[PDB]
Scaffold this active site. Sequence first.
Site, PDB file in Angstrom:
ATOM      1  N   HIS A  36       0.816  -1.350   0.120  1.00 54.13           N
ATOM      2  CA  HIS A  36      -0.001   0.138  -0.103  1.00 54.13           C
ATOM      3  C   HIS A  36       0.826   1.146  -0.096  1.00 54.13           C
ATOM      4  O   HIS A  36       0.351   2.389  -0.255  1.00 54.13           O
ATOM      5  CB  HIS A  36      -1.053  -0.020   1.211  1.00 54.13           C
ATOM      6  CG  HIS A  36      -0.444   0.408   2.369  1.00 54.13           C
ATOM      7  ND1 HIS A  36      -0.207  -0.565   3.289  1.00 54.13           N
ATOM      8  CD2 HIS A  36      -0.188   1.523   3.073  1.00 54.13           C
ATOM      9  CE1 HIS A  36       0.417  -0.016   4.701  1.00 54.13           C
ATOM     10  NE2 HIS A  36       0.439   1.211   4.448  1.00 54.13           N
ATOM     11  N   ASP A  63      -0.469  -7.618   1.075  1.00 55.20           N
ATOM     12  CA  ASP A  63       0.184  -6.019   1.402  1.00 55.20           C
ATOM     13  C   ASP A  63       1.537  -6.123   1.191  1.00 55.20           C
ATOM     14  O   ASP A  63       2.259  -5.995   2.423  1.00 55.20           O
ATOM     15  CB  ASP A  63      -0.229  -5.438   2.644  1.00 55.20           C
ATOM     16  CG  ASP A  63      -0.257  -3.906   2.570  1.00 55.20           C
ATOM     17  OD1 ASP A  63      -0.651  -3.320   3.676  1.00 55.20           O
ATOM     18  OD2 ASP A  63       0.378  -3.410   1.663  1.00 55.20           O
ATOM     19  N   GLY A 141       2.662   5.825   9.142  1.00 54.70           N
ATOM     20  CA  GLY A 141       4.175   6.222   8.848  1.00 54.70           C
ATOM     21  C   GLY A 141       4.848   4.777   9.055  1.00 54.70           C
ATOM     22  O   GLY A 141       6.021   4.639   8.356  1.00 54.70           O
ATOM     23  N   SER A 143       4.331   1.929   8.331  1.00 50.14           N
ATOM     24  CA  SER A 143       3.744   0.870   7.176  1.00 50.14           C
ATOM     25  C   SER A 143       5.056   0.642   6.452  1.00 50.14           C
ATOM     26  O   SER A 143       5.872   1.353   6.065  1.00 50.14           O
ATOM     27  CB  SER A 143       2.748   1.554   6.423  1.00 50.14           C
ATOM     28  OG  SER A 143       1.679   1.594   7.099  1.00 50.14           O
ATOM     29  N   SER A 159       1.640  -3.835   7.985  1.00 43.80           N
ATOM     30  CA  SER A 159       0.670  -3.322   7.237  1.00 43.80           C
ATOM     31  C   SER A 159      -0.512  -2.390   7.739  1.00 43.80           C
ATOM     32  O   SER A 159      -0.584  -1.466   7.034  1.00 43.80           O
ATOM     33  CB  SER A 159      -0.193  -4.761   6.794  1.00 43.80           C
ATOM     34  OG  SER A 159      -1.321  -4.421   6.034  1.00 43.80           O
TER      35      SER A 159
END
EC number: 3.4.21.12
Lengths: 198, 4
Positions: A36, A63, A141, A143, A159
């Site tokens: 993502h 993801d 952030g 992620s 994720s």
Amino acid sequence: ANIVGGIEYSINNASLCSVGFSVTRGATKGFVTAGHCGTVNATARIGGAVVGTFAARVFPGNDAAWVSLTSAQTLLPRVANGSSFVTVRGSTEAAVGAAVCRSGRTTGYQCGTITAKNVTANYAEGAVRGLTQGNACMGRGDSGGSWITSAGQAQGVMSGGNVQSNGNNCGIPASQRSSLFQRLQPILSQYGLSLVTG
Amino acid sequence: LQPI
């Protein structure tokens, strides 16, 4: 740039995410991260400089992504822990109940335990299945960032999670946290990647 | 991302 798990990078000069792990694809240098975080061909920057582009991703459903880097980048078998490092030793999957940590540009290095596997998250874009849940805290952030055991086994990439109004879930007890990572192993086989170890 |  020196490529270390957990550090900030930007995508098309816009969103920020965190590096997962240094990998190679034959002669090509790369890092894995969350799907993502960018679309194919999106430009990654670290320290204001272009370092590479998104080579491939799957999101939603999974993801996962990897960023293919210029040969000038320096791959390192390391994940940020404050000013120190956790060395990447392998990708053995830990079992439910194991301690695990994660690294990212918003909440830094955080630890907890693995509480469940094969969890579905419903995001705005669609469901993401097969995620592993822990109760280390995280925030927006983080992620893409490393999930790794203290013994150096790389688990996956950040994720999502049940962030609160302050943008993280560090202000609620561990028992109330759902912090979800995409497993590393399918990213490695999907894209023919080898983990950089040390 | 945030599960919804």
